[PDB]
Design a protein around this ligand. Structure first.
Ligand SMILES: *C/C=C(C)/C=C/C=C(C)/C=C/C1=C(C)CCCC1(C)C
Ligand SMILES: [Cl-]
Length: 212
């Protein structure tokens, strides 16, 4: 009743609506949000068309998803770093940590053997370091800003930390890992998370930009 392609098209449509909304409302921030959802839109269309479905051992891996994540997640961290007022050096640490997470996941998904769990573990370790910087140093830094900017940062930060922490569990329970969850359910859960961590993220920012 509901195929993989249908779910990919749904994500594509959701990202497109977000993209046009952010472009219209567009204060770097608006251009970043267009990139976050605009890139994801393209990845989902490509996948909806059946492009980039790579067979690996006995699983199917969706390569456009990881290219998407590698480009869009640093833009989300960049957005948060602007809100917090990071110096160009602190940016380097968190964006480096983020890239390690994304690359490790991409490599683990593409490796047929159990070495892929070794790659997954490395991304998990780097993710914990990323969470520390979001909850600690970046929160200290955001404190120096107006009370409204600080409030916006805290709300986007918690949205980000809570939801991003769910992805490694979906990955591990899905085809890439123990292959427990079926591809259709696993994809459905990730389409939901992508939409919330990108388009939902964006709309929470727009809402605050009008309350000024
Ligand atoms: C728009 C897309 C988003 C916000 C994707 C987020 C994905 C993650 C936070 C994935 C994290 C992972 C780990 C922490 C360990 C290795 C496997 C990953 C890539 C699923
Ligand atoms: Cl995958």
């Amino acid at each position: 009743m509901v195929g993989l392609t249908t779910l990919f098209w749904l994500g594509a449509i959701g990202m497109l609506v977000g993209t046009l909304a952010f472009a219209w409302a567009g204060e770097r921030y608006y251009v970043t949000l267009v990139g976050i959802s605009g890139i994801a839109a393209v990845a989902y269309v490509v996948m909806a068309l059946g492009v980039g479905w790579v067979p690996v051992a006995e699983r199917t891996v969706f390569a456009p998803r990881y290219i998407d994540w590698i480009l869009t997640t640093p833009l989300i961290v960049y957005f948060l770093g602007l809100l917090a007022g990071l110096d160009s050096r602190e940016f380097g640490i968190v964006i480096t940590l983020n890239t390690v997470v994304m690359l490790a996941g991409f490599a683990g998904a593409m490796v047929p053997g159990i070495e892929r769990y070794a790659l997954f573990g490395m991304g998990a370790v780097a993710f914990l370091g990323l969470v520390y910087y979001l909850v600690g140093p970046m929160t200290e830094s955001a404190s120096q800003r107006s009370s409204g900017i600080k409030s916006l940062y805290v709300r986007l930060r918690n949205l980000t930390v809570i939801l991003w922490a769910i992805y490694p569990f979906i990955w591990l329970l899905g085809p890439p890992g123990v292959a427990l969850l079926t591809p259709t359910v696993d994809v459905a859960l990730i389409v939901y998370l992508d939409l919330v961590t990108k388009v939902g993220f964006g709309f929470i920012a727009l809402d605050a930009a009008a309350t000024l």
